Amino acid sequence: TDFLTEAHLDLPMEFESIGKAGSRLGTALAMAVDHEINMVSLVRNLEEFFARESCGWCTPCRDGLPWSVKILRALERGEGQPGDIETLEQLCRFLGPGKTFCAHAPGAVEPLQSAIKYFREEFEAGIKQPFSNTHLINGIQPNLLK
Amino acid sequence: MGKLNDMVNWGRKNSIWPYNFGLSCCYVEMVTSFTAVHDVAASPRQADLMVVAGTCFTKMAPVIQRLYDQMLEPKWVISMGACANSGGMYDIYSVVQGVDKFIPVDVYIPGCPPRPEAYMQALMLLQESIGKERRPLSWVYRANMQSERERKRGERIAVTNLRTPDEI
Ligand code: SF4
Numbered sequence: 052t053d054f055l056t057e058a059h060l061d062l063p064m065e066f067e068s069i070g071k072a073g074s075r076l077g078t079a080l081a082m083a084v085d086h087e088i089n090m091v092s093l094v095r096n097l098e099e100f101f102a103r104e105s106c107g108w109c110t111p112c113r114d115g116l117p118w119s120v121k122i123l124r125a126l127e128r129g130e131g132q133p134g135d136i137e138t139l140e141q142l143c144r145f146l147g148p149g150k151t152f153c154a155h156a157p158g159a160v161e162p163l164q165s166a167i168k169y170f171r172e173e174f175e176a177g178i179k180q181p182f183s184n185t186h187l188i189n190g191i192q193p194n195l196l197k
Numbered sequence: 198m199g200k201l202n203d204m205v206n207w208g209r210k211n212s213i214w215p216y217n218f219g220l221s222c223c224y225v226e227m228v229t230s231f232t233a234v235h236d237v238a239a240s241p242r243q244a245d246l247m248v249v250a251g252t253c254f255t256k257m258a259p260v261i262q263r264l265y266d267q268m269l270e271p272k273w274v275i276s277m278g279a280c281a282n283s284g285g286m287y288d289i290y291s292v293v294q295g296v297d298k299f300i301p302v303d304v305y306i307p308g309c310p311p312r313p314e315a316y317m318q319a320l321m322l323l324q325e326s327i328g329k330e331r332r333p334l335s336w337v338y339r340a341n342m343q344s345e346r347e348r349k350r351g352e353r354i355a356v357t358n359l360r361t362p363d364e365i
């Protein structure tokens with residue numbers, strides 16, 4: 052289920068009330084996260100669970116949840132690179148209902164998109180190194196894209 | 198007798214007048230060969246070398262054949278570039294695939310186009326071929342020379358590192 056802030060705490064625990072806030076009522080067993088818990092570490096743990104409890108049937112969950120897991124590990128270690136948060140956002144948009152074979156992956160990407168929506172500063176604080184995907188090959192001049 | 202044939206072949210190899218009958222880009226490279234920056238230094242009747250440098254088209258082939266027949270013995274032929282050797286990149290309906298389909302060729306030059314120093318190297322090769330064979334003194338057994346490929350094999354395979362294309 053999506054994370055909610057303390058401003059959403061004054062809200063009845065009904066299906067339509069939580070749904071209109073941008074979440075799901077779910078099993079109505081709420082979990083409270085205090086201030087000293089890092090949001091990136093919490094979502095990293097959640098995505099590790101969701102990416103190892105995938106059944107492996109369909110490509111977006113099977114091959115896109117581990118990519119989000121690796122990105123969140125990099126953001127944990129301060130080894131994130133520019134474009135990682137954009138990759139997480141695109142993964143959240145492309146693992147929604149109907150894109151994947153079952154509803155495991157929408158429920159997987161709900162905490163990620165909610166924590167990006169409400170706690171974006173920590174994910175941006177995870178990015179501390181320039182984007183490098185290649186290595187220089189001696190003899191070949193690279194294509195310096197702008 | 199032995200020195201006489203050597204002096205005859207020496208005279209033939211140290212005096213060679215080319216009839217540079219070129220037809221295309223290769224001919225323009227040979228035009229650039231005559232300038233003072235390369236230092237390379239008529240009629241088919243008195244010329245002794247025919248340098249076929251360019252594409253041998255199906256319509257230009259009778260001209261090349263006639264101009265080779267107008268020459269007189271001893272006569273030598275150097276093919277320049279991929280077109281004169283094999284037809285080159287023009288495996289097409291209107292191109293004869295190599296000038297050696299209809300006239301014998303003594304020295305072949307790969308390239309498209311060869312640079313003029315390759316033509317000077319082929320002149321050296323033709324001079325060695327002339328000096329090694331022997332012809333009747335008065336009124337033809339060409340020497341089977343070692344190919345340049347196997348002769349130059351050791352110094353070519355021994356090459357390890359080359360300058361990278363990034364710098365100049
Ligand atoms: S979204 Fe569902 S069907 Fe697709 S791989 Fe994940 S658990 Fe399996």
Ligand code: SF4
Pocket residue numbers: 221222223224250251252277278279280281285308309310311
């Ligand atoms: S071998 Fe190449 S450079 Fe020479 S005539 Fe043919 S196309 Fe032109």
